[PDB]
């Protein structure tokens, strides 16, 4: 980052990386992992597992 540029943005026009306003640092924002939940279960008349 240039000395006067505090924060960057990605292709989606969302926060990508930011800088510490207190000290000199550059931190990249990577969203914490998430995903879907799939349920493998048999028929209602067979088992409830």
């Amino acid at each position: 980052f240039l000395p006067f540029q505090q924060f960057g943005r990605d292709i989606a026009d969302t926060t990508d990386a930011v800088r510490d306003p207190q000290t000199l640092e550059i931190l990249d924002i990577t969203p914490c992992s998430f995903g879907g939940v799939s349920v493998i279960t048999p028929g209602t008349n067979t088992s409830n597992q």
Binding site: A12, T30, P31, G35, G36
Partner: protein
């Protein structure tokens, strides 16, 4: 995947699809037109043409 677009893996992997192609190639050079219509039979490829 960091922006929310989940790419699901295909059910047939590369080794299974390659096994089905080699299984069909070895069958086509064996029974020819036969195994598609029924049980495989031994015929020489010289008599197949």
């Amino acid at each position: 995947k960091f922006n929310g677009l989940t790419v699901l893996p295909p059910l047939l992997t590369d080794e299974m699809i390659a096994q089905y192609t080699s299984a069909l190639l070895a069958g086509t050079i064996t029974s020819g037109w036969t195994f598609g219509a029924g049980a495989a039979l031994q015929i020489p490829f010289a008599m197949q043409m």
